[PDB]
Design an enzyme around this catalytic site. Structure first.
Site, PDB file in Angstrom:
ATOM      1  N   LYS A   1      29.747  47.534 -18.581  1.00 47.06           N
ATOM      2  CA  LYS A   1      30.598  48.727 -18.628  1.00 47.06           C
ATOM      3  C   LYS A   1      31.535  48.972 -20.048  1.00 47.06           C
ATOM      4  O   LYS A   1      32.018  50.018 -20.329  1.00 47.06           O
ATOM      5  CB  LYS A   1      31.730  48.558 -17.178  1.00 47.06           C
TER       6      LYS A   1
ATOM      7  N   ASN B   1      40.297  49.419 -18.275  1.00 41.46           N
ATOM      8  CA  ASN B   1      40.044  48.181 -17.791  1.00 41.46           C
ATOM      9  C   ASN B   1      39.751  47.309 -19.399  1.00 41.46           C
ATOM     10  O   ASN B   1      39.642  46.092 -19.261  1.00 41.46           O
ATOM     11  CB  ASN B   1      39.055  48.179 -17.016  1.00 41.46           C
TER      12      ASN B   1
ATOM     13  N   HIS C   1      33.637  39.212  -8.073  1.00 42.22           N
ATOM     14  CA  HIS C   1      34.969  39.237  -7.180  1.00 42.22           C
ATOM     15  C   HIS C   1      35.166  39.209  -5.565  1.00 42.22           C
ATOM     16  O   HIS C   1      35.668  39.604  -4.762  1.00 42.22           O
ATOM     17  CB  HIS C   1      35.696  40.668  -7.300  1.00 42.22           C
TER      18      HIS C   1
HETATM   19  C1  LIG Z   1      51.184  40.089  -8.455  1.00 37.65           C
HETATM   20  C2  LIG Z   1      50.198  40.551  -9.593  1.00 37.65           C
HETATM   21  C3  LIG Z   1      49.146  39.540  -9.939  1.00 37.65           C
HETATM   22  C4  LIG Z   1      48.890  39.655 -11.415  1.00 37.65           C
HETATM   23  O1  LIG Z   1      48.103  38.432 -12.107  1.00 37.65           O
HETATM   24  C5  LIG Z   1      46.745  38.931 -12.218  1.00 37.65           C
HETATM   25  C6  LIG Z   1      46.540  40.309 -13.013  1.00 37.65           C
HETATM   26  C7  LIG Z   1      44.933  40.582 -13.311  1.00 37.65           C
HETATM   27  C8  LIG Z   1      43.905  39.868 -12.799  1.00 37.65           C
HETATM   28  C9  LIG Z   1      42.738  40.150 -12.949  1.00 37.65           C
HETATM   29  C10 LIG Z   1      41.586  39.488 -12.278  1.00 37.65           C
HETATM   30  S1  LIG Z   1      40.295  39.781 -12.303  1.00 37.65           S
HETATM   31  O2  LIG Z   1      39.441  39.580 -11.257  1.00 37.65           O
HETATM   32  O3  LIG Z   1      39.921  41.164 -12.810  1.00 37.65           O
HETATM   33  N1  LIG Z   1      39.642  38.550 -13.359  1.00 37.65           N
HETATM   34  C11 LIG Z   1      38.556  38.823 -14.499  1.00 37.65           C
HETATM   35  C12 LIG Z   1      39.034  37.620 -15.454  1.00 37.65           C
HETATM   36  C13 LIG Z   1      37.938  37.452 -16.670  1.00 37.65           C
HETATM   37  C14 LIG Z   1      38.557  36.453 -17.827  1.00 37.65           C
HETATM   38  O4  LIG Z   1      38.405  35.422 -17.354  1.00 37.65           O
HETATM   39  O5  LIG Z   1      39.221  36.971 -18.595  1.00 37.65           O
HETATM   40  C15 LIG Z   1      37.321  38.398 -13.894  1.00 37.65           C
HETATM   41  O6  LIG Z   1      37.026  37.324 -13.279  1.00 37.65           O
HETATM   42  O7  LIG Z   1      36.516  39.562 -13.835  1.00 37.65           O
HETATM   43  C16 LIG Z   1      42.144  38.145 -11.447  1.00 37.65           C
HETATM   44  C17 LIG Z   1      43.317  37.992 -11.353  1.00 37.65           C
HETATM   45  C18 LIG Z   1      44.598  38.683 -11.882  1.00 37.65           C
HETATM   46  C19 LIG Z   1      45.628  38.175 -11.602  1.00 37.65           C
END
Ligand SMILES: CCCCOc1ccc2cc(S(=O)(=O)N[C@@H](CCC(=O)O)C(=O)O)ccc2c1
Length: 430
Positions: free
Chosen positions: A115, A138, A183
């Protein structure tokens, strides 16, 4: 849409939470902000005039709200947020706010892999044509930071989480590139729930672009792309449209079958958006790739060090391993937060006398277990790299393609990738 006089609540800070806060302020609306984290990023930039609640969700604030703007990082399923929806309190995200205001067509891209590539490529195709284009979502800038009257086209990468809270998107061209397990920590109803979020991108889209090789990308006609079939297809290798050769892939800087189907997807969306094919095909020959996406950071002393830190799921790491050519031994780094994924689809590429696994992070033990007899487990990526380094020989490849989120130990996959490249350069030269 007009927000004046509304009690607005934003869940989640960072640049995106802040872009939402700026959005409302500039409209003469002071929102309140909460984050489940104690000291979230951007807290420091927040104008003292906005009240904030950190370390937990504030139900008093939520239930008194007229509008809740939920970061993609919080689950709609969160009890506090389900309570508010049950109360009939409107819940949207940043992308929804953007779509309500956008004054130019939108090309929308989601999928488990490819993407960011296809989003960037489409932006490059617009640029080559002289089009004032805003690329983000994103990837790159949060979407609300792209809003500009002078903008002639928007190209947004959308995650499944963003799509769940979006309802006003009417894409000129939309695609789901592929759907592979990711996810699962956020989708207790499994793959079909995750796919359901992605399928939202097609609602009210002028043209839907689907993967003829991936039935999960299908809705319920769309323009298709695929390897041997589709309106956009592969036939050396040529990109073709409906039987007609359009590009000899030797002119591309990107390589690999998956980047070739990425190229078809982008071309299909650019074509649907009305961009001239000459400039679109030109952009395909100039695009060099994204950082952290199978990125050679060091090729010295007969050894290539590849930063594929953007491989945050199993399907991504597979796209790296599938048909990979290695002269000597492959030293594969795997690790981090697997998001309850099933890693066993990787097993298939890890047979032979020429592979070594170096596993780390939250799920390291799970990844080592794919083939314990060639696997080493460590706590950190740094420990794993110092472990593998003495063993690397001329003809070897060291590949960071972790199959996992980095959030258990790193700020984001970019910092993981940056640390990888630093260590490679340190351990890869005498
Ligand atoms: C109360 C608000 C919570 C804020 O914390 C967050 C904000 C965005 C997030 C995105 C995602 S996410 O699931 O989009 N995380 C990415 C991480 C990629 C990487 O390693 O850089 C993935 O695994 O696709 C998970 C947890 C999050 C928590």
């Amino acid at each position: 849409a007009d927000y004046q006089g509304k009690n607005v609540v934003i869940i989640g800070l960072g640049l995106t939470g802040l872009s939402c806060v700026d959005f409302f302020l500039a409209r003469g609306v002071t929102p309140r902000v909460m984050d489940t984290r104690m000291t979230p990023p951007g807290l420091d930039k927040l104008p003292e005039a906005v009240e904030r609640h950190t370390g937990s969700l504030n139900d008093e604030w939520l239930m008194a709200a007229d509008l809740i703007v939920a970061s993609p990082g919080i689950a709609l399923a969160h009890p506090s947020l389900s309570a508010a929806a049950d109360a009939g309190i409107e819940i949207v995200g940043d992308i929804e706010l953007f779509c309500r205001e956008a004054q130019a067509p939108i090309v929308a891209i989601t999928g488990s892999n490819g993407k960011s590539t296809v989003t960037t490529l489409v932006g490059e195709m617009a640029k080559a044509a002289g089009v004032n284009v805003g690329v983000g979502g994103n990837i790159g800038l949060p979407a609300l930071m792209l809003l500009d009257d002078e903008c002639e086209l928007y190209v947004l990468e959308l995650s499944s989480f963003q799509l769940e809270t979006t309802s006003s998107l009417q894409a000129v061209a939309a695609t789901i590139l592929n759907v592979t397990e990711d996810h699962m920590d956020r989708y207790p109803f499994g793959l079909q729930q995750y796919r359901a979020a992605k399928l939202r991108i097609y609602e009210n889209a002028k043209v839907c672009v689907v993967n003829a090789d991936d039935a999960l990308t299908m809705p319920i006609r769309c323009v298709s792309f695929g390897v041997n079939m589709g309106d956009y297809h592969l036939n050396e290798t040529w990109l073709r449209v409906k039987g007609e050769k359009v590009l000899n892939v030797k002119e591309m800087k990107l390589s690999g079958q998956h980047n070739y189907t990425n190229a078809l997807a982008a071309l299909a969306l650019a074509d649907a958006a009305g961009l001239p094919r000459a400039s679109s095909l030109k952009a395909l020959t100039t695009f060099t790739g994204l950082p952290h996406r199978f990125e050679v950071v060091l090729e010295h002393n007969g050894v290539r060090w590849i930063n594929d830190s953007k491989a945050t799921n199993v399907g991504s790491t597979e796209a790296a391993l599938n048909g990979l050519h290695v002269d000597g031994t492959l030293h594969l780094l795997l690790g981090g937060d697997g998001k309850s994924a099933d890693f066993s689809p990787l097993a298939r590429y890890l047979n032979g006398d020429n592979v070594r696994l170096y596993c780390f992070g939250r799920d390291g033990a799970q990844l080592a277990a794919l083939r314990p007899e060639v696997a080493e487990q460590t706590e950190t990526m740094e420990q794993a790299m110092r472990l593998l380094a003495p063993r690397v020989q001329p003809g070897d490849m060291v590949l960071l393609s972790p199959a996992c989120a980095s959030l258990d130990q790193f700020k984001n996959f970019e910092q993981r990738g940056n640390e990888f490249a630093r260590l490679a350069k340190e351990l890869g030269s005498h």
